[PDB]
Structure 1
Amino acid sequence: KLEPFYVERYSWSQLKKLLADTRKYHMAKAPHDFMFVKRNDPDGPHSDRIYYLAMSGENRENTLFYSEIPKTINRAAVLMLSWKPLLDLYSREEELLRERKRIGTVGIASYDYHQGSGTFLFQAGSGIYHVKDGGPQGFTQQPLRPNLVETSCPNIRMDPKLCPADPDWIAFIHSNDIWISNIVTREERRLTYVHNELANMEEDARSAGVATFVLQEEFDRYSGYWWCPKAETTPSGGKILRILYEENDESEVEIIHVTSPMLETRRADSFRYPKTGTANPKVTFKMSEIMIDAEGRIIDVIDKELIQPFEILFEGVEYIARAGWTPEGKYAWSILLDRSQTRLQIVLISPELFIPVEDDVMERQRLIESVPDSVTPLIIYEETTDIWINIHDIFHVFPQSHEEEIEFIFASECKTGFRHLYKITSILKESKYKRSSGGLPAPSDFKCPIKEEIAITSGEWEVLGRHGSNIQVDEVRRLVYFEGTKDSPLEHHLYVVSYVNPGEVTRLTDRGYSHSCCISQHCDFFISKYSNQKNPHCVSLYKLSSPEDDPTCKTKEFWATILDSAGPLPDYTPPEIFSFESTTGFTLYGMLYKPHDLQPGKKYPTVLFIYGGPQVQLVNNRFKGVKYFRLNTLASLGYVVVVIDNRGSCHRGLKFEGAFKYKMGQIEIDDQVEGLQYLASRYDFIDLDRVGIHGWSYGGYLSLMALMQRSDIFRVAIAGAPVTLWIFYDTGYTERYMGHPDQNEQGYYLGSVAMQAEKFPSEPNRLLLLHGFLDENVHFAHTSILLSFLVRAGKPYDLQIYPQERHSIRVPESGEHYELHLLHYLQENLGSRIAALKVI
């Protein structure tokens, strides 16, 4: 055998300096939310102005910038675009939204724009502001002082949107009701009256226009209202504007208490948290109909409800996943899920389906009878799966050729097990169901027949539709731009394909990098944010053209750099990606960080960093030197570091993901250990007697499962924010992967760490629990209940709390302490001479 390498035993103070010195040379948002606006100046040198959000440097606010795209370039040179700033200068609601969106940025997080006017609308903290650039008014050559939208509202205004039909009007949320405001006339008007700010949340559980917790946390829907994009003209010379909105009633949702951040207060905030197996909010759709006169004064506002209840019209629907309008405004649409998340429906909802709210019963009947039986909801698409529906942002509706026909592109994993693009044409027929007759509809009564369903894409690879990945459709050339894994599961690339006669898929991005892309609305440019394992993130602009002979065919030319990378970082060596053929039948991928200054004939302690849950892939060809820089730091101290994407992880198709359905915690460690054993047979420097594991959230969960199941392999486990009882986690996530608890008694038992506390070791210095005290996602109770049972069972543990932190670690001091304590714990209980010496 080989002699063990012991890591150098630094003091706490020494380690603190070491970590400080290595952070001080080495967190600043790359450009995002791009939009392209044509200059339309035939004598001028620029084709387009691009607008984007970004941070200028470290410790600077996220704001709007523009850059000028020239008509031509010098192809001998590389053009660096100047960032010209567009502008010249937290509530509980903001804090929580930032937690749900996972945003560490200070300042402007998003913006709205209206092409025809050039009006930008954005929140910046307390205020809602607007400015004009790039419509009729023209293009600024310097930063603009914005205009504050006046209000009489006492509380934070959230979720501002411009009316696409009239950019004088905005909507927003205030104290969970919808308001509108005219930015020229200054008229302000409340539309919904479902919440009372003055009441306790315990008595007042209604809201309008907001996505509730599970929707923000588990489906990435943050808005609950949608402007109709067109205005209906009136005989008076006026108009009608429309807002579709979700109305929620959380009355029957369980109330939990989370410690208030103001620890001095010794108080706790109420949250509506739908735990697994308990009531989700009672949802419905409503519509606000807003009549405006000839000079922009409101005449009247009519609040309208569905002609029959949501539960009757949309049998079995638990969640409104997505909603919007068709481009013409003829129909509202929605993507709807059942509770088990195995049936998706895409449904068109005519405005004629809504009637005035009328508590008077004689008049209500008059209003019900006035709506014809022919007006029904139209299920244009329905799919099922034995695994789960993964919601995405891809849904493109074409202009209507015929009143009785709708054409759209959607994406789905349900046919083949990989997400692909499909062009569907559905028939809008009169339903067999007639309200008149006084019955209830059978489930199939609103289903439309499918005329055609053609696959645009196919194969053993996915189209991406989350995290800003979407499609862009060119209706002139009849093409669709999308991102996908076709070339490699370790790289994202941009592709184009014909939707009309689908065939050759053309890759637009270069191999050897993973890419995150944005296509211009005009379909003549795209941007790629790209990196690889060796090289930090860059952002570049590419011009799209087609040959004279064939408008279908697309080519790419480099145009300009928006963001140059820092070169390779000097105090950072990347990991090697490896793979192994698993006994499970899949190729699994991993990353190996070898120890630095690797002495021959010595074997080194090993740390397995792990996530291992759904919706995430760790192993790919992206730069890891920012986010996973401390994995490199561990390697520099003489730990082997390993990361493995087990089954259940992302970007391998639905079957791969589906491996842990009903069985969370039961399979992931088998893969981790298999990878570990693959490495150890190939590399004698891995000391399998000194293996540690660490992860956060799902990673914390698995770190516990590893110690509990495989104490023969894992010497120490360091579990951050672990799920320890799946019954405490929420409906949307838990039930998706694990079903209802009654239908999976053994899965809930075996997958819940805290039900199995007897299986922990009776040796100390092996288990370390870390948790943000104020975590409203994974409640501290996961940790406290575990400890309750550990104590009852006579087992040792170590604990660290981050009393000012939620799920994330936001305050830098908290992160410095976490990093320091982690390295020190590993030093003392895994890597050093003293660690091996204290083993009993």
Structure 2
Amino acid sequence: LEPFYVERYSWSQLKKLLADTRKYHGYMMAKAPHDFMFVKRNDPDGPHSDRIYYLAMSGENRENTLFYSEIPKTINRAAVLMLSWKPLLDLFQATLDYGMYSREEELLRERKRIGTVGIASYDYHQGSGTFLFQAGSGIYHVKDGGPQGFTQQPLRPNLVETSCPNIRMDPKLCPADPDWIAFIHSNDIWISNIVTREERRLTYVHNELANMEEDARSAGVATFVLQEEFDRYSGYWWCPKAETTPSGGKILRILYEENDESEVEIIHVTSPMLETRRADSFRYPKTGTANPKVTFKMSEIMIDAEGRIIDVIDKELIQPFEILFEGVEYIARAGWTPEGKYAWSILLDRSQTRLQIVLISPELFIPVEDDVMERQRLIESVPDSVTPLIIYEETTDIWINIHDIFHVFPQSHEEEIEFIFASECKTGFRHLYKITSILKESKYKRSSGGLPAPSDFKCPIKEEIAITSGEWEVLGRHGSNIQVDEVRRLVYFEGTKDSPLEHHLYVVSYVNPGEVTRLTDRGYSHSCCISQHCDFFISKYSNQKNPHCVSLYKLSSPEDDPTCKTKEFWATILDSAGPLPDYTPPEIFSFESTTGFTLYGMLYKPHDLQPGKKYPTVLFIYGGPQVQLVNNRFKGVKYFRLNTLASLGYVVVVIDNRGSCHRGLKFEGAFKYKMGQIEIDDQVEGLQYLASRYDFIDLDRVGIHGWSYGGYLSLMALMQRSDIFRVAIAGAPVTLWIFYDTGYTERYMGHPDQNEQGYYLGSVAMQAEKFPSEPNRLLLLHGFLDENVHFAHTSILLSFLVRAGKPYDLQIYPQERHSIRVPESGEHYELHLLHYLQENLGSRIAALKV
């Protein structure tokens, strides 16, 4: 077999080639309809059953905004109904413009109002039809689908006026009174009345003028680790029901997280304003050090019969958070029971091996008092029966994977709570469990004076029915959740039962759980939303050949059996763009690993495959936890450049090694305490399977490339298996696990003290001497302003490479964080990546160079 050498293009020629292939790919950067809501018309005379609201991007270079579509009562099954997108909102037209201006100073200004005025999410109040949403700086409201009815034309968004000097974040409607909204301003919670215009600051925890070294406190906002490592952004939750006062007014309540980051390590990331030559101070809990001091607080808001604020009482926990919630480090999730009788929270220990679900009575909260005399009176005025109620507690020798599934049923019995919750802890696969918990009066008496025993708040489990089971998981992360039909007593859920390469929508009874019914067509992976009324569901679906598509499906039963659930295609929302020109999909393959697992992979055959010729091989890798790269989804948008590599004459390989997502907790836990030590074996094992099966794979010229965990494994690969991998391009790599944060590192590797050898062997920076003594094999890429994987990882690694006398190549993106945003940086990266592979792997110059 004679070796194939890629065409050796100049830098200018490659720049043009990459620009040419990018030109017809402008429509791709445009968000598909999401955040769906079904509102019933209730119009016997009218042709429509439901109006659906949703966020979407009408096209390329356009604003993510609110649209609505009409769901007919009947369809012509001969034809294919394509729903029209009606804009819910009028063109904002940024107010306080005035000036004079002209056509030449206005048609250029309209280009600047694209990325700014875009809606990321919205709130809705069914009873009033009130929409609340942030759009750029402003917080706006409109009404549709409530008592006022249904508009046939775009509505003008109503600016919520403010005296607040800074940007208002995280706006939320009060479910108990849609005249009242809350929002965050300079790390404190405010409320505002969209009718009376009354604006009121609830928390006085942060002073914007003060230094961050001094002022380390915030309220209603999730800290770094919770946003980046636990996918939680909001830190405050409205009580969904109001308490009527004797005066004829009401009490509105907000549960909120209060964080003190005083003892959290301060690091300095370079200021984006590079001319200043300054750095921003940042609270980064590096593994082994202090997380923020977290507690629960409640804001009690007394409103009179006319809707004016009487008083605001800030309340703290009767005892310290550390006493009431022994061994809890993280508030992963929080909210209210539907009646708002209890606040709930999903709490985690530092090791992230113990999850607790805790009901917190508002009665646990007493007014904040400096006077210890008056304070001691308030403590005693609260009964001993009032206590935190741990309605659930699970453990695992691997780790708790936090999800968004948790449905609380209406409280029928006084001393019982009934809920659905997902868990991997029982069978090592995420399954739905219906649990009933007895709300026992605690054996612990607060009056006695002693501290509580580890399990004095634990509630007995009356019932724990498994709703699902098997060698497959229910999905509860990154949009995946459940819809509970409390009427027909069903639960709709996404899962991997039919294949781990395809997400599918299933339905099943939660009273007499039996046969699980797939509602989505095989041959596609599905992301699904189910109507609150459980008579419709939308699917965002793709496969390897066909771009993403959004269709609506009506649910019904056979006349004779309401248990049996069927679906019928109703209408298309977003039509698929269809097979993309100059994109060849990859082939999904698999191989029986000597590890006892099936490992899946994607293979990109070189375009215009010549017979009896071996080609250079780029292995694209991530290989870290919480990610699956290999599945039956369209890859021609996100991983379009793996196709471009193939077109230039590269074999491209992707392998989901042990640790990957959607295969169960055991397959994931494979590398617990051992990160870096097992991933490249699985990559080589899969790479050697392909080489024996296909003769066109040249193992003499294998490249490896990845970002984040991919860049980390790219370095580990050149370090461990220089016999396999000629070149390694490492993007934003983790080089030293003691530098990375608490939430991620401790979850997979434990505390540094209890895994000295795991941390050492897992850190590439500590093994610089093991890198090749040949240049043109190692290339480091890093954004200079990266907040997640700091540039320090690279700079420390380089420091040790210089000591060890090893060569390296380096590219910096001075104005980029982790994810490259500014197009010029992305174009330069793509250009340099191809040129490097060309010059140091692909071409014949590369072969002569050794």
TM-score over 0.5 for the alignment?
yes
Deviation at 1:426, TM superposition (A): 0.4
For residues 364-411 of structure 1, what are the alpha-carbon distances to aligned partners after superposition, in whole Å with 9 as ceiling and x for unaligned? Answer: 121111111001100000000000000000000001111100100000
Whole-Å Cα distance in 2 between the matches of residues 570 and 349 of structure 1?
57
The answer to whether the Cα contact below 8 Å between 1:546 and 1:555 also exists between their aligned partners in 2 is: yes
2:282 to 258, 271, 281: 271
For residues 165-202 of structure 1, what are the alpha-carbon distances to aligned partners after superposition, in whole Å with 9 as ceiling and x for unaligned? Answer: 00000000000000000000000000001000110111
Counterpart secondary structure, 1:99: coil
Matching of residues 89-104 of structure 1 within 5 Å: 89=91
Whole-Å Cα distance in 2 between the matches of residues 674 and 549 of structure 1?
53
The answer to whether the Cα contact below 8 Å between 2:50 and 2:71 also exists between their aligned partners in 1 is: yes
Whole-Å Cα distance in 2 between the matches of residues 115 and 645 of structure 1?
43
Counterpart secondary structure, 1:94: coil
The answer to whether the Cα contact below 8 Å between 2:617 and 2:703 also exists between their aligned partners in 1 is: yes
Whole-Å Cα distance in 1 between the matches of residues 108 and 798 of structure 2?
30
Whole-Å Cα distance in 1 between the matches of residues 45 and 543 of structure 2?
41
Q: 1:740 to 1:105 in 2, by over 3 A?
A: farther
The answer to whether the Cα contact below 8 Å between 2:658 and 2:670 also exists between their aligned partners in 1 is: yes
Matching of residues 22-61 of structure 1 within 5 Å: 22-26=21-25, 27-61=29-63
Q: 1:672 to 1:829 in 2, by over 3 A?
A: same
The answer to whether the Cα contact below 8 Å between 1:606 and 1:691 also exists between their aligned partners in 2 is: yes
For residues 230-252 of structure 1, what are the alpha-carbon distances to aligned partners after superposition, in whole Å with 9 as ceiling and x for unaligned? Answer: 00001110000000000000000
The answer to whether the Cα contact below 8 Å between 1:100 and 1:217 also exists between their aligned partners in 2 is: no
Deviation at 1:804, TM superposition (A): 1.1
For residues 798-822 of structure 1, what are the alpha-carbon distances to aligned partners after superposition, in whole Å with 9 as ceiling and x for unaligned? Answer: 1111111100011111111110110
The answer to whether the Cα contact below 8 Å between 2:202 and 2:299 also exists between their aligned partners in 1 is: yes
Deviation at 1:548, TM superposition (A): 2.6
Counterpart secondary structure, 1:97: coil
Deviation at 1:115, TM superposition (A): 0.6
Counterpart secondary structure, 2:725: coil
Deviation at 1:29, TM superposition (A): 0.5
Deviation at 1:163, TM superposition (A): 0.1
The answer to whether the Cα contact below 8 Å between 1:422 and 1:457 also exists between their aligned partners in 2 is: yes
Which residues of structure 2 form unaligned runs of 5+? 93-101
The answer to whether the Cα contact below 8 Å between 2:61 and 2:114 also exists between their aligned partners in 1 is: no
Deviation at 1:362, TM superposition (A): 1.5
Whole-Å Cα distance in 1 between the matches of residues 113 and 606 of structure 2?
32
Counterpart secondary structure, 1:677: helix
Q: 1:99 to 1:300 in 2, by over 3 A?
A: farther
For residues 723-772 of structure 1, what are the alpha-carbon distances to aligned partners after superposition, in whole Å with 9 as ceiling and x for unaligned? Answer: 00011100000000000000000000000010111111111100100011
Counterpart secondary structure, 1:681: helix
Q: 1:105 to 1:698 in 2, by over 3 A?
A: farther
The answer to whether the Cα contact below 8 Å between 1:478 and 1:498 also exists between their aligned partners in 2 is: yes
For residues 478-521 of structure 1, what are the alpha-carbon distances to aligned partners after superposition, in whole Å with 9 as ceiling and x for unaligned? Answer: 00000000000000000000000000100000000000000001
Q: 1:651 to 1:144 in 2, by over 3 A?
A: same
Whole-Å Cα distance in 1 between the matches of residues 507 and 411 of structure 2?
24
Deviation at 1:550, TM superposition (A): 2.6
Deviation at 1:140, TM superposition (A): 1.1
> For this pair of structures, how many residues does the alignment match?
838
Deviation at 1:98, TM superposition (A): 24
Deviation at 1:101, TM superposition (A): 23
For residues 195-240 of structure 1, what are the alpha-carbon distances to aligned partners after superposition, in whole Å with 9 as ceiling and x for unaligned? Answer: 0011011100001000000000000100000000000001110000
Partner of 1:451: 462
Deviation at 1:89, TM superposition (A): 3.1
Counterpart secondary structure, 1:804: coil
Whole-Å Cα distance in 1 between the matches of residues 115 and 618 of structure 2?
28
Q: 1:453 to 1:92 in 2, by over 3 A?
A: farther
The answer to whether the Cα contact below 8 Å between 2:62 and 2:114 also exists between their aligned partners in 1 is: no
Whole-Å Cα distance in 2 between the matches of residues 18 and 515 of structure 1?
34
Whole-Å Cα distance in 2 between the matches of residues 341 and 270 of structure 1?
28
Deviation at 1:551, TM superposition (A): 2.5
Q: 1:600 to 1:416 in 2, by over 3 A?
A: same
Does 2:147 correspond to 1:126? no
Q: Which moved more, 1:175-184 or 1:36-45?
A: 36-45
Whole-Å Cα distance in 1 between the matches of residues 684 and 390 of structure 2?
47
The answer to whether the Cα contact below 8 Å between 1:29 and 1:105 also exists between their aligned partners in 2 is: no
Whole-Å Cα distance in 2 between the matches of residues 531 and 434 of structure 1?
57
Counterpart secondary structure, 1:96: coil
The answer to whether the Cα contact below 8 Å between 2:63 and 2:114 also exists between their aligned partners in 1 is: no
Whole-Å Cα distance in 2 between the matches of residues 102 and 729 of structure 1?
37
The answer to whether the Cα contact below 8 Å between 2:286 and 2:739 also exists between their aligned partners in 1 is: yes
The answer to whether the Cα contact below 8 Å between 1:100 and 1:216 also exists between their aligned partners in 2 is: no
1:392 to 403, 412, 419: 403
Q: 1:101 to 1:382 in 2, by over 3 A?
A: farther
Q: 1:699 to 1:350 in 2, by over 3 A?
A: same
The answer to whether the Cα contact below 8 Å between 2:123 and 2:131 also exists between their aligned partners in 1 is: yes
The answer to whether the Cα contact below 8 Å between 2:116 and 2:136 also exists between their aligned partners in 1 is: no
Partner of 1:746: 757
Counterpart secondary structure, 1:435: coil
The answer to whether the Cα contact below 8 Å between 1:595 and 1:636 also exists between their aligned partners in 2 is: yes
Whole-Å Cα distance in 1 between the matches of residues 460 and 108 of structure 2?
40
Whole-Å Cα distance in 2 between the matches of residues 105 and 435 of structure 1?
53
Q: 1:120 to 1:550 in 2, by over 3 A?
A: same
The answer to whether the Cα contact below 8 Å between 2:4 and 2:615 also exists between their aligned partners in 1 is: yes
Whole-Å Cα distance in 2 between the matches of residues 219 and 607 of structure 1?
32
Deviation at 1:553, TM superposition (A): 2.2
Counterpart secondary structure, 1:95: coil
Q: 1:106 to 1:276 in 2, by over 3 A?
A: farther
The answer to whether the Cα contact below 8 Å between 1:47 and 1:70 also exists between their aligned partners in 2 is: yes
Whole-Å Cα distance in 2 between the matches of residues 805 and 95 of structure 1?
30
The answer to whether the Cα contact below 8 Å between 2:589 and 2:600 also exists between their aligned partners in 1 is: yes
Whole-Å Cα distance in 1 between the matches of residues 551 and 282 of structure 2?
43
Q: 1:711 to 1:675 in 2, by over 3 A?
A: same
Deviation at 1:708, TM superposition (A): 0.5
Deviation at 1:97, TM superposition (A): 28
Whole-Å Cα distance in 2 between the matches of residues 497 and 98 of structure 1?
53
Deviation at 1:100, TM superposition (A): 26
The answer to whether the Cα contact below 8 Å between 1:101 and 1:220 also exists between their aligned partners in 2 is: no
Whole-Å Cα distance in 1 between the matches of residues 198 and 804 of structure 2?
65
The answer to whether the Cα contact below 8 Å between 1:323 and 1:332 also exists between their aligned partners in 2 is: yes
Deviation at 1:570, TM superposition (A): 1.2
Q: 1:254 to 1:99 in 2, by over 3 A?
A: farther
Q: Which moved more, 1:453-462 or 1:808-817?
A: 808-817
The answer to whether the Cα contact below 8 Å between 2:712 and 2:735 also exists between their aligned partners in 1 is: yes
Q: 1:624 to 1:767 in 2, by over 3 A?
A: same
Q: Which moved more, 1:672-681 or 1:92-101?
A: 92-101
Deviation at 1:102, TM superposition (A): 21
Deviation at 1:95, TM superposition (A): 26
Deviation at 1:106, TM superposition (A): 6.9
For residues 449-484 of structure 1, what are the alpha-carbon distances to aligned partners after superposition, in whole Å with 9 as ceiling and x for unaligned? Answer: 000001000000000000110000000000000000
Whole-Å Cα distance in 1 between the matches of residues 364 and 244 of structure 2?
19
Deviation at 1:443, TM superposition (A): 0.8
Deviation at 1:269, TM superposition (A): 0.7
Whole-Å Cα distance in 2 between the matches of residues 721 and 468 of structure 1?
26
Deviation at 1:25, TM superposition (A): 1.1
Whole-Å Cα distance in 2 between the matches of residues 93 and 451 of structure 1?
72
Q: 1:521 to 1:532 in 2, by over 3 A?
A: same
Q: Which moved more, 1:66-75 or 1:82-91?
A: 82-91
Deviation at 1:99, TM superposition (A): 26
The answer to whether the Cα contact below 8 Å between 2:256 and 2:297 also exists between their aligned partners in 1 is: yes
Which residues of structure 1 form unaligned runs of 5+? none
Partner of 1:503: 514
Q: 1:810 to 1:354 in 2, by over 3 A?
A: same
For residues 37-56 of structure 1, what are the alpha-carbon distances to aligned partners after superposition, in whole Å with 9 as ceiling and x for unaligned? Answer: 11111111111111111101
1:324 to 324, 327, 335: 335
Counterpart secondary structure, 1:248: strand
Q: Which moved more, 1:202-211 or 1:261-270?
A: 261-270
For residues 592-636 of structure 1, what are the alpha-carbon distances to aligned partners after superposition, in whole Å with 9 as ceiling and x for unaligned? Answer: 000011111100000000000000000000000000110001000
Q: Which moved more, 1:261-270 or 1:741-750?
A: 261-270
The answer to whether the Cα contact below 8 Å between 1:62 and 1:105 also exists between their aligned partners in 2 is: no
Deviation at 1:549, TM superposition (A): 2.6
Q: Which moved more, 1:783-792 or 1:158-167?
A: 783-792
Whole-Å Cα distance in 2 between the matches of residues 97 and 121 of structure 1?
30
For residues 339-361 of structure 1, what are the alpha-carbon distances to aligned partners after superposition, in whole Å with 9 as ceiling and x for unaligned? Answer: 00000000000001111111111
The answer to whether the Cα contact below 8 Å between 1:478 and 1:552 also exists between their aligned partners in 2 is: no
Q: 1:556 to 1:393 in 2, by over 3 A?
A: same
The answer to whether the Cα contact below 8 Å between 1:98 and 1:104 also exists between their aligned partners in 2 is: no
Q: 1:465 to 1:347 in 2, by over 3 A?
A: same
Q: Which moved more, 1:85-94 or 1:368-377?
A: 85-94
For residues 298-327 of structure 1, what are the alpha-carbon distances to aligned partners after superposition, in whole Å with 9 as ceiling and x for unaligned? Answer: 000001011001000000000000000000
Whole-Å Cα distance in 1 between the matches of residues 704 and 847 of structure 2?
17
